[PDB]
């Protein structure tokens, strides 16, 4: 169950973007409008 769950939650549709596998993003946050990124 953990095996299948981990493979399903790490699975991706396009195989060529898997090369990055071997900061969160704005749309994950959906808030902190003026606080996206930081100075310096």
């Amino acid at each position: 169950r953990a095996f299948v769950q981990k493979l399903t939650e790490t699975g991706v549709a396009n195989p060529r973007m898997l090369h990055s596998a071997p900061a969160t993003g704005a749309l994950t946050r959906f808030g902190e409008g003026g606080s996206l990124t930081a100075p310096d």
């Binding site: 169950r1 953990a2 769950q5 939650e9």
Partner: protein
């Protein structure tokens, strides 16, 4: 793959529902955080009946919590097994019904019913199949009584071919924490008799009597009363969640218990209740559970089973046991006192066996009784209603919210019509 959607209403339903989800989560091995840490493979096989799969392996209950004042949801969210519930299901009012059946039905219920219907449509349409709907509420109150009965009206109009199992706690003769229980209960039953497919009748005085005379508790609390309800509520769904030699859904218990559409008020009881002193001397055996099953003290209704004949009955045994003495024991009670059973229905009792007993018990059984003795608890509600309706007591509060005095009479007439067809089968 077939599921039950649970709806809790008001002060009573939220506390009863929180104890109900305390037991079935312990049965299926979900910790208060949410992760499955059970130690049985059969627990995980049927999770989808009561829990949704979430990310990270978490399970959230398929429950809708609704009320009209936010006091309950401060208490429910703060308790053990309390953070597993979805906050989107936490739909709340602000005014509070205040023990008024008309306030929850027409005035402030109406703005909240459109909100509670969207989350039911969100939860029922999210699955593949529905076994039915399970609701626990009160009749003497106002928050779960007036608002709950309109919810049953709209959900039956939208989903007409699905089961409706209601655990309604009725006003009590011995105890009474309110003044307008006969007003709210008579209006609730008049809305419930045509809409609810089946009904479990509960009361506080029978639960207090079980905790006192049978379970030997010196100072029982509402938590003790809600635990007896929770064991029975999980006992109805025993064959759904777990395999067995006999399988029975809510429709299996529906078809064997109502000869006619209007006789859908049952009385329930949980069998293996014993004080701590005599547990080692008592031999937990199928004749012992059957003896306590038909006993009048084990019933969780105000109706005395010796006064009225049982029309139909159901026994839901849990645990590894032989069906022969299961069948023979209910055969024995049909022949020992045949006057307590109806004559024109043969094989009055339905039996089903589940092979997974509850936690900490080797054997258990849940009893469902369709009895004509349940007319007597509705008469006392009707007797107290006619005590105050003839002098128009507390009626100006009800007519303020927009309900006329006319539909108190069809509420009165259908209460008297419901009991009148009960005595015609007792003879």
């Amino acid at each position: 793959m077939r599921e039950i959607v649970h709806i809790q209403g008001g002060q009573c339903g939220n506390q009863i529902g929180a104890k109900f989800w305390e037991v079935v989560s312990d049965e299926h091995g979900i910790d208060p955080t949410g992760t499955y840490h059970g130690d049985s493979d059969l627990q995980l096989e049927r999770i989808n009946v009561y829990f949704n799969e979430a990310t990270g392996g978490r399970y959230v209950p398929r429950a809708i919590l609704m009320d009209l004042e936010p006091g309950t949801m401060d208490s429910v969210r703060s308790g053990p097994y309390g953070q597993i519930f979805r906050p989107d299901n936490f739909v709340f009012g602000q005014t509070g019904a205040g023990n008024n059946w008309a306030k929850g039905h027409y005035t402030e219920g109406a703005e909240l019913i459109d909100s509670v219907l969207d989350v039911v449509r969100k939860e029922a349409e999210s699955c593949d199949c529905l076994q039915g709907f399970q609701v626990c509420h009160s009749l003497g109150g106002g928050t779960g009584s007036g608002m709950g009965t309109l919810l049953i009206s709209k959900i039956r109009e939208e989903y007409p071919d699905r089961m409706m199992l209601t655990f309604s706690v009725v006003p009590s003769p011995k105890v009474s924490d309110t003044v307008v229980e006969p007003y709210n209960a008579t209006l609730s039953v008049h809305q419930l008799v045509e809409n609810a497919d089946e009904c479990m009748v509960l009361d506080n005085e029978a639960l207090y009597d079980i905790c006192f005379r049978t379970l030997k508790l010196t100072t029982p609390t509402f938590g003790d009363l809600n635990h007896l309800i929770s064991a029975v509520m999980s006992g109805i769904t025993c064959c759904l969640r777990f395999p067995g030699q006999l399988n029975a859904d809510l429709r299996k218990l529906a078809v064997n218990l109502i000869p006619f559409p209007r006789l859908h008020f049952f009385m329930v009881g949980f069998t293996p209740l014993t004080s701590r002193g005599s547990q080692q001397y008592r031999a937990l055996t199928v004749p012992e559970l059957t003896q306590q099953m038909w006993d009048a003290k084990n019933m969780m209704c105000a109706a005395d089973p010796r006064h009225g004949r049982y029309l139909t009955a159901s026994a839901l045994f849990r645990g590894r046991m032989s069906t022969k003495e299961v069948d023979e024991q209910m055969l024995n009670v049909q022949n020992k006192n045949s006057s307590y059973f109806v004559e024109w229905i043969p094989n009055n009792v339905k039996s089903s066996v589940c092979d997974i007993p509850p936690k900490g018990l080797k054997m258990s059984a849940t009893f469902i009784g369709n009895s004509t003795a349940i007319q007597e608890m509705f008469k006392r509600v009707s007797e107290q209603f006619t005590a105050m309706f003839r002098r128009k007591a507390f009626l100006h509060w009800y007519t303020g919210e927009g309900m006329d005095e006319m539909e108190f009479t069809e509420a009165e007439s259908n209460m008297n019509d419901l009991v009148s067809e009960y005595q015609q089968y007792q003879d």
